[PDB]
């Protein structure tokens with residue numbers, strides 16, 4: 275009821291950030307985990323670090339922006355888990371910081387492609403694998419940016435809106451198939467995604483600091499504070515929860531004028 | 533204050549349905565309207581009908597899925613309006629009815645391309661014409677399917693969720709340039725089985741008419757609607773308000 279012992283999981287983008295915390299969380303609870311990123315060297319250091327802790331994790335290098343690579347990854351995962359998937363976490367995603375009128379066609383292709391299209395497409399080709407397990411969970415990762423507008427990430431927000439709506443549809447269409455579908459939508463979590471952005475441009479430093487002051491709790495979240503909810507939603511204890519988007523944001527989205 | 537006299541408007545997909553009604557409504561209240569569709573003879577009979585009833589309306593054929601044709605359309609709109617656009621109504625849209633697991637890449641490209649990308653790209657390049665008018669308005673068409681899940685239209689819902697979010701971002705960024713951006717999200721407006729079900733779900737017990745949507749789009753463009761930005765308003769006969777009736 276509160277264990278993932280003997281479950282199979284695919285977590286996309288698990289070499290850093292929230293994704294690293296998620297594979298360590300599910301694998302600690304007893305899941306067989308498979309993950310992926312775009313740097314084999316980085317992916318390798320992870321597999322060794324995880325192998326040293328007694329965590330049962332596998333992985334391969336995959337750019338999720340390519341349809342044929344998504345097709346291949348799922349073949350691998352089907353062979354390794356023997357045609358059975360319990361959990362799919364569509365964690366991987368990217369952000370680009372510009373004004374709404376400056377985003378290009380290529381930015382559009384990068385953001386919607388990895389943040390929405392890849393995530394949705396994996397959910398499609400995973401369906402039969404999750405169905406065959408009879409206890410399937412699809413978790414998408416949204417954002418506070420999928421609630422109200424934030425500066426410099428308009429096109430990112432749009433992609434998180436597609437995710438939020440896609441969550442509801444899959445939840446209703448697949449519930450009869452014993453698959454539950456939810457999104458976890460973080461506040462500011464201090465990861466590479468934010469550190470790279472604020473290193474690049476001190477205007478992004480500004481914006482982030484002001485997201486944290488807006489956060490009633492007055493601090494950025496920790497990756498594990500997000501993976502904890504992601505783990506819970508996969509517990510059989512969570513068997514009536516589907517179609518939900520839940521913010522883990524320190525009260526950010528509850529805050530109107532504080 | 534309740535006048536659109538001497539405004540300039542671009543509404544996409546004005547050759548039928550809600551887009552037709554919006555052209556007539558906006559033009560009937562004094563706006564100069566530019567519109568487009570995908571075939572000459574359909575677009576041309578509208579242009580003939582609207583001119584006979586004294587409406588000030590122009591139009592050209594465009595495929596909103598081509599980025600080159602979107603650029604060329606905005607350059608043409610820029611020419612005829614003299615660099616000044618008050619109103620942009622992103623009306624054009626499509627639906628494909630499949631199960632979530634069945635939608636192909638072509639489906640994705642048509643539905644996301646038409647509903648979100650074209651609506652977004654047009655907004656990017658209209659921006660200086662709207663900024664120049666010093667009284668801008670961009671309006672997206674959303675859907676009840678961008679509120680909660682409906683059968684057969686998962687990928688379409690997603691494209692409306694993206695629109696909902698973009699109308700908040702654009703509203704917040706462009707508010708200083710006096711451009712206001714809102715979405716109108718209709719319910720069923722005039723798969724039978726499915727549509728029949730949605731209608732008994734809407735408290736008013738009937739499907740809407742096109743001019744029940746355009747009425748709201750016209751008001752949102754009035755100077756009277758000056759403090760209203762970043763909203764999504766469902767014109768749905770109560771559909772979204774109803775949990776269990």
Ligand SMILES: NC(=O)c1ccc[n+]([C@@H]2O[C@H](COP(=O)([O-])OP(=O)(O)OC[C@H]3O[C@@H](n4cnc5c(N)ncnc54)[C@H](OP(=O)(O)O)[C@@H]3O)[C@@H](O)[C@H]2O)c1
Nearest residue numbers: 287289291292311312313337338366367417462463465467
């Ligand atoms: N950090 C925050 O404050 C925050 C807030 C709200 C929501 N989120 C969401 O949380 C998720 C992860 O964010 P994060 O902060 O953990 O990001 P991150 O630190 O930048 O890590 C992203 C992970 O995804 C992988 N990835 C990205 N694109 C990939 C691709 N095309 N193919 C394969 N792998 C790919 C990256 O690997 P490579 O670098 O090797 O490619 C990396 O392993 C995203 O959906 C993000 O939108 C984050």
Ligand SMILES: NC(=O)c1ccc[n+]([C@@H]2O[C@H](COP(=O)([O-])OP(=O)(O)OC[C@H]3O[C@@H](n4cnc5c(N)ncnc54)[C@H](OP(=O)(O)O)[C@@H]3O)[C@@H](O)[C@H]2O)c1
Nearest residue numbers: 545547548549550569570595596623624625673675720721
């Ligand atoms: N009808 C409803 O019940 C309903 C409900 C909720 C939301 N909506 C939204 O309302 C908007 C209009 O819906 P509608 O029912 O009036 O649609 P419709 O009857 O299908 O008309 C769409 C219009 O857009 C044009 N169009 C479509 N694709 C185009 C393209 N690629 N390039 C150029 N023009 C294009 C079509 O022209 P051509 O045929 O000549 O190409 C047509 O004039 C859409 O955004 C839809 O999402 C409608």
